[PDB]
Amino acid sequence: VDPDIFNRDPRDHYDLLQRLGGGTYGEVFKARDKVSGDLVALKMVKMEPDDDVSTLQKEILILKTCRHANIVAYHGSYLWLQKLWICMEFCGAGSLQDIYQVTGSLSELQISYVCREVLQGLAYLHSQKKIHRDIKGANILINDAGEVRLADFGISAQIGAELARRLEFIGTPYWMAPEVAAVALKGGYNELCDIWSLGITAIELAELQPPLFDVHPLRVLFLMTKSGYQPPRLKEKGKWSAAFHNFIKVTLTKSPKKRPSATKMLSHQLVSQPGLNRGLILDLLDKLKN
Numbered sequence: 001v002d003p004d005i006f007n008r009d010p011r012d013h014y015d016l017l018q019r020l021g022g023g024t025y026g027e028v029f030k031a032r033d034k035v036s037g038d039l040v041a042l043k044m045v046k047m048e049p050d051d052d053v054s055t056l057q058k059e060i061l062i063l064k065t066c067r068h069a070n071i072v073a074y075h076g077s078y079l080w081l082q083k084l085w086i087c088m089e090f091c092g093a094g095s096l097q098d099i100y101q102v103t104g105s106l107s108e109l110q111i112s113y114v115c116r117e118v119l120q121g122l123a124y125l126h127s128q129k130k131i132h133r134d135i136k137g138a139n140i141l142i143n144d145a146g147e148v149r150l151a152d153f154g155i156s157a158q159i160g161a162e163l164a165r166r167l168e169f170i171g172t173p174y175w176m177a178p179e180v181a182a183v184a185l186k187g188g189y190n191e192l193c194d195i196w197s198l199g200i201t202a203i204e205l206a207e208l209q210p211p212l213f214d215v216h217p218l219r220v221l222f223l224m225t226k227s228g229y230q231p232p233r234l235k236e237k238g239k240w241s242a243a244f245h246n247f248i249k250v251t252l253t254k255s256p257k258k259r260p261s262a263t264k265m266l267s268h269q270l271v272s273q274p275g276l277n278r279g280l281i282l283d284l285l286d287k288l289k290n
């Protein structure tokens with residue numbers, strides 16, 4: 001299917017180092033290029049005859065076609081002996097979740113900078129008709145240069161494959177009510193779901209967990225679907241500026257018809273204020289080291 005797939009053992013090119021962690025699926029390993037010495041992350045997914053090939057096809061299609069400074073670099077994929085290895089950028093400091101578990105809460109300027117960089121990556125993804133659908137601290141990586149990169153298109157690939165598979169058993173739409181046609185064509189939502197998740201992520205970076213993290217997941221799902229659901233807010237109002245409170249208020253707009261787009265959010269005071277540069281992330285990395 002993909003003409004650029006390498007039909008060889010990745011071990012021909014890389015020496016496999018330690019296990020780094022897991023993604024939505026697959027296992028991610030640190031590896032080193034045998035000729036250049038460049039470090040990479042190799043995500044290994046089992047690919048036996050009855051494994052989910054459509055999702056992996058969709059994930060590699062996203063990685064190959066969505067190249068941006070705020071998305072982890074993709075180097076190519078290997079298929080050998082029923083294992084698929086996806087080669088991506090090695091981001092030395094891991095995710096923001098790994099960082100704040102050592103470092104504690106990020107400052108408002110650091111959160112603003114992360115939000116700006118993630119919004120640039122989201123505006124790019126949405127412009128190519130892609131939706132991340134899994135924005136959280138665990139999926140925002142920080143490299144040694146203090147660059148902010150979105151990772152793990154596993155959820156995006158699974159939904160993309162499921163929606164393509166379903167649009168074969170859809171049948172004629174002429175008798176469908178508009179709200180049924182909406183779930184048939186778009187799954188009942190749009191790319192603005194990523195704006196809400198970024199608002200939640202900003203709270204997560206400020207408080208070390210998303211709102212209601214201690215509440216049973218099924219109860220959280222039930223509460224969100226009910227009428228009268230109030231969007232979350234920062235708990236310590238006095239610790240944060242009016243700009244940060246307004247950023248949370250507008251990214252957490254309950255109605256998707258009124259939630260601002262990534263490009264509109266890029267004009268917000270929080271991500272347009274003075275003093276936003278990689279130096280803020282370099283300070284976070286200094287705290288992580290010491």
Ligand SMILES: CN1CCC2(CC1)CN(c1ncnc3[nH]c(Cl)c(-c4cccc(C#N)c4)c13)CCO2
Binds near residue numbers: 021023043151
């Ligand atoms: C909770 N944390 C999450 C992140 C992590 C430690 C545990 C670390 N992590 C990485 N570390 C360094 N460079 C990397 N390059 C890349 Cl791409 C990753 C990476 C990070 C997150 C998801 C995926 C995927 N699909 C890949 C990555 C692998 C996953 O687990």
